Design a binder for this molecule. Structure first.
Ligand SMILES: CC(=O)O[C@H]1C(=O)[C@@]2(C)[C@H]([C@H](OC(=O)c3ccccc3)[C@]3(O)C[C@H](OC(=O)[C@H](O)[C@@H](NC(=O)c4ccccc4)c4ccccc4)C(C)=C1C3(C)C)[C@]1(OC(C)=O)CO[C@@H]1C[C@@H]2O
Ligand SMILES: CC(=O)O[C@H]1C(=O)[C@@]2(C)[C@H]([C@H](OC(=O)c3ccccc3)[C@]3(O)C[C@H](OC(=O)[C@H](O)[C@@H](NC(=O)c4ccccc4)c4ccccc4)C(C)=C1C3(C)C)[C@]1(OC(C)=O)CO[C@@H]1C[C@@H]2O
Ligand SMILES: Nc1nc2c(ncn2[C@@H]2O[C@H](COP(=O)(O)OP(=O)(O)OP(=O)(O)O)[C@@H](O)[C@H]2O)c(=O)[nH]1
Ligand SMILES: Nc1nc2c(ncn2[C@@H]2O[C@H](COP(=O)(O)OP(=O)(O)OP(=O)(O)O)[C@@H](O)[C@H]2O)c(=O)[nH]1
Ligand SMILES: Nc1nc2c(ncn2[C@@H]2O[C@H](COP(=O)(O)OP(=O)(O)O)[C@@H](O)[C@H]2O)c(=O)[nH]1
Ligand SMILES: Nc1nc2c(ncn2[C@@H]2O[C@H](COP(=O)(O)OP(=O)(O)O)[C@@H](O)[C@H]2O)c(=O)[nH]1
Ligand SMILES: [Mg+2]
Ligand SMILES: [Mg+2]
Lengths: 431, 430, 27, 431, 430, 27
């Protein structure tokens, strides 16, 4: 049937992929050794040998430590040994290294592995890519890989779950350079990009889950929950099914505006589950509050272009219609005038599954919400500002130039980013 | 996979290297005979970064011992942990520089550098994927400074794309151990500023201050100072040997910390540092480590960062933690001390986290700061240099080896230019 | 004897690239 | 159906709320954990989980001490954790701190919780607010909350339970300032405001219950019994139901005169219960003695404008009519000429419930009386007098001014109070 | 939560602080080693107001040790409850003020205040929501008065919105422990009237009278006096640690007891105080506590309240009682003694009730009165000051530290203005 | 040498805000 291929690159991508594959194995009842103790999961797992299910995944990094952690973990006997590809020297937070110097050494091997995995599929629908903007390997190799993919396939859809840089929290100094360069070179080679912020997830964990020590495991578990809710309609059946193509058809009004924001509900802890009834109306309301968005940007500062809702479990379509109508009448949210109908809904029968030892309580229904809004324009502006601050004095430029990146490229990227900002300002004005 | 070659030169280098190797062997569970006796697999999964494996489980540190006199390495060899090192790595001459930069750079160095280069080449051929080189030495000494500069230049000519780290001991501001300390020091930096990727500055006075004031040590010896320096050394490179939530190797630090090629002098620091009795009076939490980072009295160089502005900062944590706490602490530090950071570099802070703590600790913390205040150090040195160069004091010692006053003038001018650059980069201009 | 490496950075004029204004004259 | 929301502010409000919710849970047979051991109580409790009932209550205070007392008491698992909102520093008997400097920090969070609770109700009709005039947090934050509620909603009723300062007993030096300021601010935002007086309840407990050690538990139990008698018409069906709106339609003749007085009968001890065969007529008579009033003021000094009677239990309408007629013919009390019909009467089937460990005996009939009388005017005068005695020399004024409150505000408040006094003497004159 | 940082300076400050911390530790059930061996959850629920929790179930008091001579706090450290304190909070000089206000305020204090402020900042930033600062000292000493005024001014500059409370040992009216106490007292009040939120005055003579008359103690020592002072301190700060029916914190007391910014000098008192043999003949009832508190003999300051009129009164009852009885006693006191209360303030009395019974008896009560009669004290000091300033006696001792007679004139003029204010606030004018 | 700020506070005239007298002349 329809098959999806997952690619995880860099430290963030690899760890998010680990969490995602643990979640899939738990949801489908597959043991960590590839055996089923007791079948629509052909979308993600292929059958090899006698009852062994191998995930359709590719794990790429230029540094072997995190992949080595994978190879010795609980899921050692789950992944194909050749699907875990490693380099020797990482990009070292240098976009040019992961794009021009180090990326080109293993890009061909990665493409060969992807082709071998894809030729098996008969109904391939698209690619899932997990990476981060700030990292060198992430941004550089992801940009190179998507350029190669768009050249090779073109028609198949390509999706990203990227980590947007936080407004205040940062873990690198060269972050704006890499972010701007990779956004400029990936703007024309993508179909939909869902972005999350570590700071926003920290706020979510502190405010709702009541966790004071949210390590990266919890963040990756939340992200994996969102990805699972996105792919559920493929992996199961419901009253209203949505595949990957409908996402880009409904959320992307123009080819240069494909940066929606992903939220989730209900994110509550075990003890507060007793005091709350998780009804469709209230979780739909919670999906639209600014305090629940997992990117540090206020929706009230802009207008929604398109919205997509995905419901799981015990859900009645009439309640969904009523809740969406109630949201529409409310004037706390704003919609562009040129988009009279701004909702795409999907309903699935399979309820979410709670990973044992986790932090989320057990619920019978859940909502995943994606919004394409101009409120992200502000974030773009901020990044550009930082770029300028560090480019008026040529700070750190020699590091990139010594790796084969001509200086004018930086200007090009900045110029393009400015144009993109103008784009948003043009579509945020009603007629 | 990333492996590091270690070099020590002079008395300072040899002492620091002995302490560093003792600490490293303790961390990886290696007994002095070279036979692994650890209790965890993580100690062997990444043992090849520092140790070659010999026939019979024996492990040989990938180290080289260089000196122009045999006394220090004879003490090293006859002492404990003297049988781990392969005897072929002990290189020595018979004269000694005698605190003369010219003697150690042009005459004795010309004799020993070929043998040292043979040894490093042989070591690097056994290397699979070399990460870079690490050197330990002192600036105020003859063979230390001279051979360090000579070796650094030769290797930079040999492998220009690799990584060079140096742990230098810059001269102290109040009490000097050598009369000709200024000359050599200047003649060292004029080479380093052109051939070293990054360099950490160490002051014995700051170490004495830390030992007396914080560790409450009444009689600090060089053993304790080398203990602290080795702790910082191990903290820097921990991400190459153990997994963590956020990794960082040498190249990543060099990229994140050096905005311009001529500004690669950092001031290291370590945390936590407590006495034998006061550790019961305070908690082991991330905010405590972060406060010990940005303490003017905790720095390992005798330069007050408050007099200048930080350019970049690296914080490397060890032990199980929460990332959110680390980022909140970094945000708080940046917001409160916003007058100590350059305006043209948003997000001055780089962060790394490693899961495995030091043996016997819950958590640890290593600080690296690239501050403009370091220029004061350089300025002071320059002053002393010219204060002795107008009268041509002690000059016949150096000019009797082949140098000329033009080399001194060039070194002084380059030092002045570096000071001018450091001062100029404190201007907002926006 | 040395000067700060500073350049005159500016984004003079940038136009929007999406063609949302093309069909606004349609009856 | 019809829903009500209870708001408790400050120390007094929170303690009264705890007593009231214990009483409600006992009345409706709900265990302290929220379960039921065996349904018109959707007005106050909302259903959730598997047969768990969550009160529609919000607890607000600027100090965590009393809320933490609640959070560890017997009813810890009854309240929703997000409904107990705490600050970090209290107003410290400062109106300005609770209204301008400190209150504005959490007013937004309180309003967010309020609207989240309100959207859950389909037929919400009003809010109940419990607070104290004398305190800083109570008066200031209550005024701010009433301002915000009136702006946001406007049409829903807003009833008030407030602790009027006692004429002699005092527990603070700055009571007149806070009382005058909060009365000036809230005079045009409260639909109706009943009052209780601690000195009067002390007197009641001494004279009737034969108690010489009346801790605040006894007073809060009395107040809870009164509010239960007020809301029983909503919570149970009776021969003559009275809503929340009928109170204000029947007891407030002008928008500026909405300060009734609350009494209760019968208040007897267990020992004297056996020697008195309590009947409807005698209870109605008992509700009209000055000694049984719960505000230390003599109704014989003024004239009634409107009276409301709420009967519970074994009650016969003919006896109610006869008793009220006898009261009307008795000339020891007076009624304003322009109100020939000055009575509203409601009857409810469910008798009051005796809390074990309490101090009131078991009766089959009870009466709650609310009278809007001009005799309260004297009280205002006294307060105003005290304010003047303290304002001629500008005592404590710097404390309020340093928090941003302009000095002229004080003048306005005092002037407003003067007008209010005039208002009363204008309507206490027959024609 | 609401947390208090405690400062002690000088001999009296250190001794009173040691006794106070012993009292608090016994109340919260903490052994001298600092490990909680209590029996109630309320002891640990609000332990953070005074204690910081360290690793391994240990509690460190949030206290600072300040002195200009090492003898007093060396005695503190070597004695019992000496290992509970953090050693880094002990700040000592080497010279000592020598009962000289100028020496401790301008010369030695100038050297010590930087370190003390650094320690205070470190303590404060480790807090969550600081409630205020509390200081204990005297006015007749050099170190106490000078350094206390200096620290109070510096902290008020640092945190202008927090709460400053002081427990000051004012000079006794009859017997003086130093010849130059009027100078120091005047120069200290000249700063207290401007930089302190509120101040409680305690006189050693009144405490001697209390122990000899009420407690029937033959040989009172400073231990008993510091015991009484600590009991008063604990009674004052009990609403922050234990729940009560009606509670009041420091800001509430300041608001309810300070009508004007220059009138913040209170007289404290404690009840019940009784001997061992008389405890069998009296009944602990609320009226008895109220009658004891409003007693001229029971005051902890050597001023007779019957000479003047109260401005405000605070009564902090503790234990389990009925507030009907409390209010009836307040009403009875107000009506009976209506000649001792200002007419321009109704409701002179503020009441608070703490549920937890005092460590000790069933019920207890603390009294804090703001009476105009305290002006007599100031007036008396004025006389002595001028009686010693006309002849310029001992003046060179002070003017040799850089001070000048202008400062003396300013101090005496300011405090005479304060005396005028306190005296003439006894006019009804209505 | 310090006099207090004693203010001559007085409420000379205040007019009622209730409109009770508006229709007193009604037939
Ligand atoms: C009960 C307890 O806590 O024992 C500690 C100890 O008391 C203290 C004071 C230790 C102790 O360190 C010192 O006394 C010291 C003296 C001079 C210079 C530096 C340190 C300790 O020696 C150090 C030693 O630390 C280690 O073992 C680390 O792994 C350390 N390794 C060594 O110091 C070492 C010693 C001998 C041989 C080989 C290594 C290390 C630190 C950083 C990076 C790698 C390794 C331990 C736990 C202690 C003692 C024994 C007293 C401290 O050491 C460190 C850096 O962890 C000093 O600051 C810490 C704080 C500790 O509380
Ligand atoms: C045998 C017995 O029951 O005697 C009692 C006692 O009730 C008496 C004698 C106690 C006792 O106090 C004195 O003897 C005393 C002597 C001089 C000055 C001050 C006190 C007692 O020490 C006081 C002590 O109080 C406490 O329980 C608290 O711990 C007390 N703390 C300490 O005394 C203390 C001493 C050293 C180290 C740590 C704490 C306290 C008091 C007020 C506020 C907080 C704590 C108790 C049980 C008594 C004795 C032992 C005789 C009194 O205590 C107080 C201050 O309330 C004296 O005034 C009361 C009168 C009481 O009758
Ligand atoms: N949410 C989340 N973010 C992560 C995780 N790991 C890394 N990141 C993000 O990644 C950023 C750092 O860049 P990396 O992705 O680690 O860089 P890289 O992929 O290792 O590539 P190199 O820089 O060449 O090593 C940080 O700012 C983090 O926000 C993770 O596990 N979860
Ligand atoms: N009847 C009754 N009155 C109470 C109760 N608790 C407090 N009060 C009254 O409240 C007054 C004191 O003010 P508070 O209610 O404590 O003020 P607050 O709401 O806590 O706000 P703050 O002044 O900032 O502390 C006293 O005069 C009491 O009469 C109670 O349980 N029952
Ligand atoms: N920290 C530390 N510093 C040292 C040690 N030995 C020497 N030094 C410093 O190095 C300087 C002397 O350099 P030295 O090695 O004798 O010169 P060389 O003979 O040319 O190598 C002095 O300023 C010392 O402070 C040591 O063991 N530890
Ligand atoms: N109540 C009390 N008073 C004290 C104590 N110690 C000293 N004093 C008083 O403090 C005054 C001496 O001040 P001192 O502390 O010696 O000055 P300093 O040493 O320079 O700070 C004397 O008048 C004593 O009465 C004590 O433990 N308790
Ligand atoms: Mg990486
Ligand atoms: Mg309060």
């Amino acid at each position: 049937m329809r098959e999806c291929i997952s690619i995880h690159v860099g430290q963030a991508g690899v760890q998010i992929g680990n969490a995602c594959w643990e979640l899939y194995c738990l949801e489908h009842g597959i043991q960590p050794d590839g055996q089923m103790p007791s079948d629509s999961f052909n979308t993600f797992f292929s059958e090899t040998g006698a009852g062994k299910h191998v995930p359709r995944a590719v794990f790429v990094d230029l540094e072997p430590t995190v992949i080595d952690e994978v190879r010795t973990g609980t899921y050692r006997q789950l992944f194909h040994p050749e699907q875990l590809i490693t380099g020797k020297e990482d990009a070292a937070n240098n976009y040019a290294r992961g794009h021009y110097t180090i990326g080109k050494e293993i890009i061909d091997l990665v493409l060969d592995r992807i082709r071998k995995l894809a030729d098996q599929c008969t109904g391939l629908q698209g690619f899932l890519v997990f990476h981060s903007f700030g990292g060198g390997t992430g941004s550089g190799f992801t940009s190179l890989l998507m350029e190669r993919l768009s050249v090779d396939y073109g028609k198949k859809s390509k999706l990203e779950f990227s980590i947007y840089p936080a407004p205040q929290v940062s873990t690198a100094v060269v972050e704006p350079y890499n972010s701007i360069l990779t956004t400029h070179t990936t703007l024309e080679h993508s179909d939909c990009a869902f972005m999350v912020d570590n700071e926003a997830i920290y706020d979510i964990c502190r405010r709702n889950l009541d966790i004071e020590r949210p390590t990266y495991t919890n963040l990756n578990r939340l992200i994996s929950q969102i990805v699972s809710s996105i792919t559920a309609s493929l992996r199961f059946d419901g009253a209203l099914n949505v595949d990957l193509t409908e996402f880009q058809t409904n959320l992307v009004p123009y080819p240069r505006i494909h940066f929606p924001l992903a939220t989730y509900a209900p994110v509550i802890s075990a003890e507060k589950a007793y005091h709350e009834q998780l009804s469709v109306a209230e979780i739909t309301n919670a999906c639209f509050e600014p305090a629940n968005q997992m990117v540090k940007c206020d929706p009230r500062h802009g207008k929604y272009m398109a919205c997509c809702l995905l419901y799981r479990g015990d859900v009645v379509p009439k309640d969904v219609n009523a809740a969406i109508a109630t949201i529409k009448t409310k004037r706390s949210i704003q919609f562009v005038d040129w988009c009279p109908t701004g909702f795409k809904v999907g309903i699935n029968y399979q309820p979410p599954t709670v990973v044992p030892g986790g932090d989320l309580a057990k619920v019978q229904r859940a909502v995943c919400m994606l919004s394409n809004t101009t409120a992200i324009a502000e974030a773009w502006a901020r990044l550009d500002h930082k770029f300028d601050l560090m480019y008026a004095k040529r700070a750190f430029v020699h590091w990139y130039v010594g790796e084969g990146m001509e200086e004018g490229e930086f200007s090009e990227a900045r110029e393009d980013m400015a144009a993109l900002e103008k784009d948003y300002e043009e579509v945020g004005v009603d007629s | 996979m990333r492996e590091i070659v270690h070099i020590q030169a002079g008395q300072c280098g040899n002492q620091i290297g002995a302490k560093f190797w003792e600490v490293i062997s303790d961390e990886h569970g290696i007994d002095p005979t070279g036979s692994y006796h650890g209790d965890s697999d993580l100690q062997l999964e990444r043992i090849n970064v520092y140790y070659n494996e010999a026939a019979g489980n024996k492990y040989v540190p990938r180290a080289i011992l260089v000196d122009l006199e045999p006394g220090t390495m004879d003490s090293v060899r006859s002492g404990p942990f003297g049988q781990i090192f392969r005897p072929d790595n002990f290189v020595f001459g018979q004269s000694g520089a005698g605190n003369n930069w010219a003697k150690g750079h042009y005459t004795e160095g010309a004799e020993l550098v070929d043998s040292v280069l043979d040894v490093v080449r042989k070591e690097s051929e056994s290397c699979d994927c070399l990460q870079g080189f690490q050197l330990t030495h002192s600036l105020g000494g003859g063979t230390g400074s001279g051979m360090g500069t000579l070796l650094i230049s030769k290797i930079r000519e040999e492998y220009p794309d690799r990584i060079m780290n140096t742990f230098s001991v810059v001269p102290s501001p109040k009490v000097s151990d050598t009369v000709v300390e200024p000359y050599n020091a200047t003649l060292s930096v004029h080479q380093l500023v052109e051939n070293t990727d990054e360099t950490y500055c160490i002051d014995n006075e700051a170490l004495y201050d830390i030992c007396f004031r914080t560790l409450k040590l009444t009689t600090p010896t060089y053993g304790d100072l080398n203990h602290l320096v080795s702790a910082t050394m191990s903290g820097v490179t921990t991400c190459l040997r153990f997994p963590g939530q956020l990794n960082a190797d040498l190249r990543k630090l060099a990229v994140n910390m050096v905005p311009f090629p001529r500004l690669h002098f950092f001031m290291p620091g370590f945390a936590p540092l407590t006495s034998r009795g006061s550790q019961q009076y305070r908690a082991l939490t991330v905010p405590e480590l972060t406060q010990q980072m940005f303490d003017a009295k905790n720095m390992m160089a005798a330069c007050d960062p408050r007099h200048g502005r930080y350019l970049t900062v690296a914080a490397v944590f060890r032990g199980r933690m929460s990332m959110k706490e680390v980022d909140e602490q970094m945000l708080n530090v940046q917001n409160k001390n916003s007058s100590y950071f350059v305006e043209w570099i948003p997000n001055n802070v780089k962060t790394a986290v490693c899961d495995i703590p030091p043996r016997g600790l819950k958590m640890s913390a290593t600080f690296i700061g690239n501050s403009t205040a370091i220029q004061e150090l350089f300025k002071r040195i320059s002053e002393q240099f010219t204060a002795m160069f107008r009268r041509k004091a002690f000059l016949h010692w150096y000019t009797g080896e082949g140098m000329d006053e033009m080399e001194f003038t060039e070194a002084e001018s380059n030092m002045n230019d570096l000071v001018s650059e450091y001062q100029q980069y404190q201007d907002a201009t926006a | 004897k040395v000067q700060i490496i500073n350049k005159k950075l500016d984004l003079s004029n940038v136009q929007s690239k999406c063609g949302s204004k093309d069909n606004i004259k349609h009856v």
